[PDB]
């Protein structure tokens, strides 16, 4: 029931092909699809972007299976109020492919270009502090948002991790790095360049669909700890 539109054609940058269901190899519990409720789109980060932000500057390092929950627990309510994420509350183990849109609403007279890049397991590297820059993330496939034409960045992100399931709460073999797939990071390339009488603000909204998800390992919702701030 969430239907969203854009006036401009997207620029998708699919990193990897579509993956298999993966329910045959490590789950005998009721592996239930929730495409009627979890495939809704959901706003997880909006932010102001003005011209004071310099050339090579981060805007949002969204960790996407976390940020779907982190926007909720940041936005003054628990998981049980949002119908997208209640199977994370009930079930313990998650898998699934993501869809990510980064809409802009820039005026046409503005000149600028954001980039959106998906990276796999940012927090599982220490050297990303050397890489967290536009020149590194340009080499891998990445979407681009020109503030001239107010382009939109659709971005299919298939699930690819070392283990074929991301857990949703504290789990007996790892705790730290819960439900972490990697970084959606929105790096500025061309900053806002306008006249003296120019429109300074440029808000950026990020939506996320979660379609080919599977949830397994039903357990009690009182076990689910809050995500990290």
């Amino acid at each position: 029931n969430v239907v969203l539109t854009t006036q401009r054609d997207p620029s998708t940058s699919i990193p990897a092909p579509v993956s298999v269901k993966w329910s045959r190899w490590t789950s005998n519990d009721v592996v239930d699809d929730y495409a009627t409720i979890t495939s809704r789109w959901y706003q997880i980060a909006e932010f102001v972007w003005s011209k004071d932000d310099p050339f090579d500057k981060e805007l949002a390092r969204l960790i996407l299976p976390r940020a779907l929950l982190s926007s909720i627990e940041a936005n003054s309510d628990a998981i049980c109020d949002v119908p997208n994420t209640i199977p994370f509350k009930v079930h313990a183990y998650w898998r699934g492919d993501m869809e990510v849109r980064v809409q802009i609403n820039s005026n046409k007279f503005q000149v600028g270009q954001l980039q959106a890049t998906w990276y796999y397991s940012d927090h599982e590297n220490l050297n990303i502090s050397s890489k967290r820059s536009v020149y590194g993330f340009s080499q891998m496939d990445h979407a681009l948002i020109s503030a001239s034409a107010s382009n939109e960045a659709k971005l299919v992100i298939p699930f690819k991790h070392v283990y074929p399931f991301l857990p949703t709460r504290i789990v007996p073999d790892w705790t730290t790095g819960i439900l972490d797939m990697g970084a959606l990071n929105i790096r500025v390339i061309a900053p806002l360049r306008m006249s003296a009488t120019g429109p300074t603000t440029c808000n950026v909204v990020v939506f996320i669909k979660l379609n080919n998800s599977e949830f397994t390992g039903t357990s009690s919702g009182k076990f689910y700890a809050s995500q990290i701030r």
Binding site: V20, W22, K108, F109, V111, Q113, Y135, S138, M194
Partner: protein, 371 residues
């Protein structure tokens, strides 16, 4: 049955080849349990990607060029070299650089050839109107790096672009050279072994005339991708290293070390001779005629003081209680180790102690004193 037929007549060698990486059956000792076993990739684990042209068909952002309103109708924007080795400097005592992926995967080879499609993405509105040459001159040396302008550029191959409703174009840099390939610009750490084959240029043919509602300045981004005919051949020592470990160690000589295979040492005894690693060698201190030398570093006690030829072909370092017994006046003054004066200055054997070794090869300090 008796096998009396005369047998083979071979040559042994100790090791299989190393540079061979191709249609060649390599025998090993697998720690796998199965002889027919091979690591496998199930239905999701079949990996997406590996190929030189798979790397060379990726744009890498390599140059930010500011392009202002008041740049004149001949002003230079970049004179950057038409190799894949594009210089992008990041602001340590060594410096780090971005490169195009075609730049690095060129830097893991000796030679390259083929086109180089540089993409100029000129970020502007449709209200800005511009015009700029992307020229290309084959074969300009360093002394010919000057004398360059658009009027002398248009003799060579050039592409004039109008910045309008479309804002992006990928120019394809030709490969024009006398040689079928082209040697790597940088090479190993080796001061000889050559600049670019050819040079790109980008001059502003008609300056930016913006509208008064938009900005005077315009970013121009310059991407580099290897062309469709790009190919590299000879695998040599790479000219680029990672920044996982940017630590570097100089090798000036005014520093000391023990010789190779003789550190760590420990204070102990020796029946021919305190003094071991089998006595540990030490470098011969370059002492001219009329000086003396003693050592102080940068058993029962830490031995911070310690060189003379043993007589068995290599130097020894004798431990002393202090720099006073060490302070070499007897030995450089004409004495010998068998002297009673020398044997009193030596440390007796009882100070061997538990004998904990030195940490690696500890750099001593060479004190040179007049005699």
């Amino acid at each position: 049955p008796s096998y009396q037929q005369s047998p083979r007549h071979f040559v042994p060698t100790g090791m299989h080849s190393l540079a061979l990486g191709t249609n060649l059956v390599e025998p090993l000792h697998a720690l796998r349990l199965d002889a027919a076993g091979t690591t496998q990739h199930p239905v999701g684990c079949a990996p997406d990607e590996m190929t030189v042209s798979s790397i060379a068909s990726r744009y890498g952002l390599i140059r930010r060029v500011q392009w202002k309103k008041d740049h004149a109708k001949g002003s230079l924007l970049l004179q950057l070299d038409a190799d894949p080795f594009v210089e992008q400097r990041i602001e340590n005592p060594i410096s780090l650089y971005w490169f195009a992926p075609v730049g690095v995967v060129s830097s893991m080879f000796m030679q390259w050839r083929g086109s180089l499609e540089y993409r100029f993405d000129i970020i502007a509105s449709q209200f800005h109107t511009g015009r700029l040459i992307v020229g290309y001159v084959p074969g300009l040396t360093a002394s010919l790096q000057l004398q360059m302008d658009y009027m002398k550029l248009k003799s060579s191959s050039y592409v004039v672009f109008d910045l309008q409703e479309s804002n992006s174009f990928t120019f394809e840099v030709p490969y024009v050279s006398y040689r079928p390939w082209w040697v790597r610009k940088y090479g190993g750490n080796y001061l000889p072994s050559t600049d670019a084959p050819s040079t790109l240029f980008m001059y502003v043919q008609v300056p930016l005339i913006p509208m008064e509602a938009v900005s005077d300045t315009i970013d121009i981004n310059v991407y580099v991708r290897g062309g469709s005919s790009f190919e590299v051949c000879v695998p040599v020592q790479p000219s680029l290293g990672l920044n996982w470990n940017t630590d570097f160690i100089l090798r000036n000589d005014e520093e000391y070390r023990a010789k190779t295979g003789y550190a760590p040492y420990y204070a102990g005894v020796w029946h021919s001779f305190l003094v071991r690693w089998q006595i540990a060698q030490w470098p011969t201190i370059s002492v001219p005629r009329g000086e003396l030398a003693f050592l102080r570093i940068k058993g029962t006690q830490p031995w911070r003081t310690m060189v003379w030829p043993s007589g068995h072909g290599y130097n020894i370092g004798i431990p002393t209680y202090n720099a006073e017994r060490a302070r070499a006046q007897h030995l450089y003054g004409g004495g010998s180790l068998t002297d009673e004066k020398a044997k009193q200055l030596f440390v007796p054997a009882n100070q061997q102690g538990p004998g904990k070794v030195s940490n690696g090869n500890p750099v001593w300090e060479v004190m040179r004193a007049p005699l």
